[PDB]
Design a protein around this nucleic acid. Structure first.
Ligand SMILES: [Mg+2]
Ligand SMILES: [Mg+2]
Ligand SMILES: [Mg+2]
Ligand SMILES: [Mg+2]
Lengths: 53, 84, 105, 160, 128
RNA sequence: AAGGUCAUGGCUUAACAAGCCAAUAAUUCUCUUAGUCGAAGCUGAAAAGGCUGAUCGACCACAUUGGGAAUGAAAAAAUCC
RNA sequence: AUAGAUGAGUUUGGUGAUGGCUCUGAUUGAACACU
């Protein structure tokens, strides 16, 4: 019983009055932590070689 | 073990103690050879093992053979394409 | 009935680096991680431990990253066994003698 | 690591002491976790990932940040809007508790005691206005959000 | 100074990673478990910053300086006894990093055999 | 490799290898002091609090000092030499 | 166990600090003096 009660609370939904009152944070900033490789990493590297030469 | 147990131990069995040290002397001898062989490969912390390429620094790869002297003039790697 | 088979149990898996090799046969020193808690300062300190691991086929080289498992008693000081190589050192894995599975050992 | 959170705490103190309307922070998931909790607690006004220059002040929420890739990850920064009410900063003090030299962890019963203003462990009881942020497996939470979810974890800093 | 900057061109031409990728048989370190080789962008210029080049450049400076401290009146130069110690400790750190980073790659052995760098140069403590 | 073991371990033995632990004192030695511990006693608002180590319980040691063995299921004696 | 956290005298021509000392609280397998 002590385990179910504690596990239920840690995975409970936020309060409604907390949802309809808290300001908005764009998901582009609050969830985009992953940093992928530059898709143009190969094109840029080929242009940087020409400019450096 | 303490020093009292040392003398006491070797006093009980004088002969058995002697045999134990004869075998230890064999490994202490073999271990001294491997050290002298590893210290040689250790080298110098500044020079290590002077190679013909390191010797070519003195002339910037322009000399074909190292200076003599005892020593012997050995060929060195060169970079004749480099200018000033 | 009269056959006393080994336990054949699987213990935890630790990742570490091989510190020494070739000095003794079928044995290498592996450095693993750890952390001991100081109760007076109330903090953790790095507590790395170096064990002697069992290399049956002599397939490990110094500087190699391997995964070891305890509970495999082979000698007085050897209670760990190599599970598999994470990152080889010097030569590829396929160019070394294979590591037997725990079932084979 | 915890050193970045310690730099984020002392920097926000200096930005509020200087009465700056904006302030930048290094762009890391750890700093973003604490900033979201400060914003969720109402201590800061905004959070926006951007470049080395602050976005347009008026169009701050509708700002369109470019995707973060390896070609610009080195120049990204988190821009924080600071609050000042009644000629006083809303984020006056940010005192860290767990430091690089020692990570202080609290249990659920210690947080229950610190929430009502009673010392427990290396922490002290909370008074009127003070807040405490704990880094738990459920994210960076406020001590009263942690005891509600019944979890402990690493104590980050006490916000006066 | 003319030979100093001419030697720097020799180190970049000999140990330059842009040249050893094709000169050596197995320059890169052996792959790990599960890791597979993927193509990466080409270099926009010569390799002048790899640990091999830096360790080679430091070797040329250590010789030019250690050879001047051993010459006539070299013992009277007390200030540059720190410079030699500072060059050996800078090379010790790069050798100590490249040792674990390269995991015994053919590119690591080429540097040692060519420059004559023995374990004494990075293993323990350099006391001068 | 063999023996031993409920089993494990140079635990034991033969033959080989030169290792293993440590490098900031592992190891060893000298001097000074002390029986150890407990919400057992006293004390502080409190700290892995401080102090003590009476009466109580647990443990260690001793029986004028030093040097020893046997008996016995077991030394665990104010025994014995 | 959620009530539990306190001071005072004393350096200086004077002021603010620093820093000890002493007193205020509780106690003893206590001793001594007067009872
Ligand atoms: Mg650490
Ligand atoms: Mg002079
Ligand atoms: Mg005594
Ligand atoms: Mg005066």
């Amino acid at each position: 019983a002590r385990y179910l009660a504690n596990k239920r609370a840690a995975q409970a939904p936020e309060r409604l009055d907390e949802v309809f009152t808290r300001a908005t944070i764009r998901e582009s900033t609050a969830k985009n932590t992953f940093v992928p490789l530059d898709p143009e990493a190969f094109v840029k590297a080929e242009e940087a070689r020409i400019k450096h030469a | 073990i303490s020093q009292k147990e040392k003398k006491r131990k070797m006093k009980q069995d004088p002969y058995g103690w002697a045999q134990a040290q004869q075998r230890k002397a064999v490994n202490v001898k073999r271990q001294a050879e491997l050290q002298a062989q590893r210290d040689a490969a250790w080298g110098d912390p500044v020079k290590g093992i002077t190679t013909p390429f390191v010797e070519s620094f003195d002339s910037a790869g322009q000399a074909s053979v190292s200076p003599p002297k005892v020593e012997e003039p050995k060929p060195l790697p060169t970079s004749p394409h480099l200018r000033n | 009935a009269a056959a006393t088979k080994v336990s054949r149990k699987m213990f935890r898996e630790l990742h570490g680096v091989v510190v020494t090799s070739g000095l003794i046969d079928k044995t290498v020193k592996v450095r693993v991680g750890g952390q001991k808690f100081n109760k007076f300062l109330q903090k953790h300190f790095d507590d790395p431990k170096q064990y002697l691991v069992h290399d049956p086929n002599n397939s490990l080289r110094a500087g190699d990253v391997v995964a070891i498992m305890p509970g495999f008693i082979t000698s007085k000081s050897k209670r760990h066994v190599v599970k598999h190589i994470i990152a080889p050192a010097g030569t590829p894995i396929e160019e070394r003698p294979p590591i037997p599975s725990l079932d084979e050992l | 690591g915890i050193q970045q959170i310690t730099n984020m705490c002392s920097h926000l103190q200096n930005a509020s002491r200087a009465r700056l309307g904006l302030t930048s922070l290094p762009n890391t998931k750890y700093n973003l976790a604490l900033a979201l909790a400060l914003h969720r607690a109402g201590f800061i006004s905004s959070i926006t990932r951007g470049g080395p220059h602050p976005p347009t002040p008026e169009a701050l929420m509708t700002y369109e940040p470019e995707p973060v890739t390896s070609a610009n990850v080195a120049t990204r920064r988190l821009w924080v809007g600071l609050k000042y009410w009644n000629e006083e900063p809303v984020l006056k003090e940010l005192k860290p508790i767990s430091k690089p030299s020692r990570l202080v962890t609290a249990s659920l019963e210690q947080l229950n005691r610190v929430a009502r203003g009673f010392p427990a462990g290396y922490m002290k009881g909370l008074q009127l206005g003070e807040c405490l942020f704990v880094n738990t497996d459920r994210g960076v939470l406020e001590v009263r959000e942690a005891v509600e979810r019944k979890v402990g974890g690493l104590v980050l800093c006490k916000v006066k | 100074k003319d030979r100093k900057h001419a030697n720097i061109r020799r180190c970049i031409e000999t140990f330059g990673r842009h040249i050893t990728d094709q000169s050596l048989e197995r320059p890169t370190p052996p792959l790990a478990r599960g890791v597979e080789p993927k193509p990466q962008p080409v270099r926009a210029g010569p390799d002048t910053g790899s640990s091999e080049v830096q360790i080679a450049i430091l070797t040329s400076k250590i010789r030019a300086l250690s050879k001047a401290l051993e010459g006539h009146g070299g013992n009277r130069d007390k200030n540059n006894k720190r410079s030699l110690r500072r060059l050996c400790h800078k090379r010790q750190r790069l050798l100590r990093y490249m040792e674990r980073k390269e995991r015994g790659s053919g590119r690591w052995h080429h540097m040692l055999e060519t420059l004559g760098l023995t374990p004494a140069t990075w293993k323990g403590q350099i006391t001068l």
